Amino acid sequence: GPYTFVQQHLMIGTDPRTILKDLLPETIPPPELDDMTLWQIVINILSEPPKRKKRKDINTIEDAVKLLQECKKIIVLTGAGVSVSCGIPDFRSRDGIYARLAVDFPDLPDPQAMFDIEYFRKDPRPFFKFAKEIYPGQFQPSLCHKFIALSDKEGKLLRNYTQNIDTLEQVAGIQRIIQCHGSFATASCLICKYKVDCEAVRGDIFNQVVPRCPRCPADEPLAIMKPEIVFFGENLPEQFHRAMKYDKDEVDLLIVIGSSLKVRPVALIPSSIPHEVPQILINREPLPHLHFDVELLGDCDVIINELCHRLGGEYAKLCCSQYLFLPPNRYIFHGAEVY
Amino acid sequence: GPYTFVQQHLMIGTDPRTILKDLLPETIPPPELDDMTLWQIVINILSEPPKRKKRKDINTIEDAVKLLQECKKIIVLTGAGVSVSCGIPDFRSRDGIYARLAVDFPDLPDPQAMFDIEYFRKDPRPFFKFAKEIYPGQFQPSLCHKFIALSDKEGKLLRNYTQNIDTLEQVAGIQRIIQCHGSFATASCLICKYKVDCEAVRGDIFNQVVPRCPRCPADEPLAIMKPEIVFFGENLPEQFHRAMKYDKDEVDLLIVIGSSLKVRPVALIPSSIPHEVPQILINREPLPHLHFDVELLGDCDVIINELCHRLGGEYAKLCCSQYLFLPPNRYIFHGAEVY
Ligand SMILES: O=C(Nc1cccc(-c2cnco2)c1)N1c2nc(-c3cccc(C(F)(F)F)c3)ccc2N2CC[C@H]1C2
Ligand SMILES: O=C(Nc1cccc(-c2cnco2)c1)N1c2nc(-c3cccc(C(F)(F)F)c3)ccc2N2CC[C@H]1C2
Ligand SMILES: [Zn+2]
Ligand SMILES: [Zn+2]
């Protein structure tokens, strides 16, 4: 669109600067800039998609808390950060759970292969030994899970969108949730798609027995009950999109906790809601590509404790401090790791 | 990489401007710019991939001709432009050849469907009626085809890469070629992959007979001989990549004719060769996103005639004029359509 606009102008010999004098007033582009380069800049300015800019009137951790109090339709996005204190065995790294699996199951190429649906059909047994070391109840939720849970009890949580699959969200008692990469909440047969509760296949998996489908014939191979993890290639749950279409025009506050927001669909949620709605980051590291009103950087448990401290009331009854303030709105706490 | 660099700096409260005073000397960013915005700019400058900038010493159509003379390892990229004079029925538009096909074959959803391999299996007959209206010999090559052909006779053509499938390249006698979206040059069975010449299935297709595979049993459905067009989904010919790996470090001149360079793999060829190697555009419209040393805009036949005029010698014996000069290097001829 803008591209054609510039093509038109090139056809007649327009001096880009007269266009740039309009698009960048109070800015004079250096003399030694190539004239085609100038045009490319023109296209860029016109092509740049509207990205939310930071609210100048929301800056301090005190402002954060007010929001937390006065808001009532809150969207919370959570990543690996929320579950760092939970002692969960890592599984993405070649050195992790894949280590203890490669010894009993030497047919595993990648730690990714156990999350591929194709290899799952060949051998589901390695995944299910993993599914045992992770299954809900085996791990205590973090202060953060507890924090989200209470705000949903208070009717304030509009939705918790998560990248996690540890399903500690349900363990911790959070009702209004959406697990984007799936979870252990339910299990569905690969074949007749018979859906069952989480508790249905608990015993089977705890006995290292591959859960079988009760509807399908017993003489059926792939009549296996698979926890509804989004395995490679598989589509994002339909519940996600339907939820966003509603939530985006309803939320009055977005909080990010523990995520470095670089993997879809969760990474695109900040950029997709009304720019006016306030936005708070809580995270080990800063996220330059986005404009957050308040940045609380450091260990996510730490910062959630510091906010429950300040929120008082029922929130303070969850707690078990020092920061560096970089203006206008950045706070560095203990666990700021930036790697 | 640059992203982490900026994360580090945010952790300690660096003023972006002291970084920008270094990255943009002789440029002072407006006062009212958000400090996170400034950082985003920092990331952009550091993240920007090296793109060839225009040679200041190559500008005029006379310079173009010198190149054409003194060069001997020339890469020529061609698009729809080269074949506009050739009277070929269009086939991409819903209103085109798909018009005369939808009446005899009402099972066609798209004009794209006849280029899908999946629908081709269901019914190949519509494609083959198209393949008849297009088949080599039925159309006379343009002045441009002839131009490329002669330069390859003279040993100057390193390679002609094309987006076209009209195969007028072989009709016109160009040996050193690469047809990126495939061509009618050869045909291969969907099953045993028996390869045959173009002339092998000429008779069959001219009689509206679906060419059959001589190796496969006669009682075989998909033993059909398919012209090696890249149909939807299919991979780019292996001949392409192997050719580029050689050609990129060998070419001394790149010429673009008739293409608006926006569809891969052909669109990425200018950006992928040594920046020092000169680059000439010949095209209905200008291509802002790229930096061409000389821009000859207008009908491609016109401009090729004007160059054969000037090249003299064997080139002038092909010919059957007015321009507007926009400095430093843009020429507008007759067919400049910019749509
Ligand atoms: O896009 C810009 N510059 C730019 C400058 C100002 C604003 C924007 C912009 C992009 N989206 C909204 O605004 C973009 N580019 C750019 N800008 C410059 C540039 C350098 C110094 C000063 C200036 C400026 F903007 F004129 F002051 C631009 C140089 C090369 C480039 N490259 C060619 C096009 C790209 C990459
Ligand atoms: O990328 C730029 N600007 C920019 C400016 C100068 C050079 C480059 C650039 C990009 N690649 C090589 O150089 C890019 N952006 C940009 N630039 C500006 C801008 C406006 C006026 C002046 C200037 C400048 F560059 F400081 F003079 C930048 C404003 C907003 C933005 N947006 C936030 C980041 C994007 C989009
Ligand atoms: Zn079943
Ligand atoms: Zn065959």
Author numbering:
A (entry chain A), B (entry chain A): 183 to 502, 640 to 658
Please, what does the article write about this entry?
Sirtuins generally catalyze the deacylation of modified lysine residues in protein substrates coupled with the breakdown of NAD+ into nicotinamide (NAM) and 2'-O-acyl-ADP-ribose. To address this, we developed an engineered hSIRT1 (mini-hSIRT1) that is biochemically equivalent to the full-length enzyme with respect to basal catalytic activity and activation by STACs. Mini-hSIRT1 comprises a catalytic domain that assumes a Rossmann-fold large lobe and a zinc-binding small lobe common to all sirtuins, an N-terminal three-helical bundle encompassing the SBD and a C-terminal β-hairpin CTR peptide18.
X-ray crystallographic analysis of mini-hSIRT1 resulted in the first detailed structural determination of a fully functional human SIRT1 with a bound small molecule activator. The N-terminal SBD forms an independently folded, three-helix bundle with 1 binding to the helix-turn-helix (H2-T-H3) motif within the SBD, consistent with the HDX-MS and enzyme kinetic results. STAC 1 interacts extensively with the hydrophobic side chains of Leu206, Thr209 (methyl), Pro211, Pro212, Leu215, Thr219 (methyl), Ile223 and Ile227 from the H2-T-H3 motif with only one hydrophilic interaction: a hydrogen bond with Asn226. The major mini-hSIRT1/1-binding site is a shallow hydrophobic surface depression with an off-center, deeper hydrophobic pocket, that the CF3 group of 1 occupies. This is consistent with the observed structure-activity relationships developed across multiple STAC chemotypes, indicating the requirement of overall flatness of the core scaffold maintained by an intramolecular hydrogen bond. In the crystal structure, Ile223 lies directly beneath the STAC and lines the pocket into which the meta-CF3 of 1 inserts. Asn226 appears to form a hydrogen bond between its carboxamide nitrogen and the carbonyl oxygen of 1 on the surface of the protein. Interestingly, a STAC-mediated dimer of mini-hSIRT1 related by crystallographic symmetry was observed in the crystal lattices.
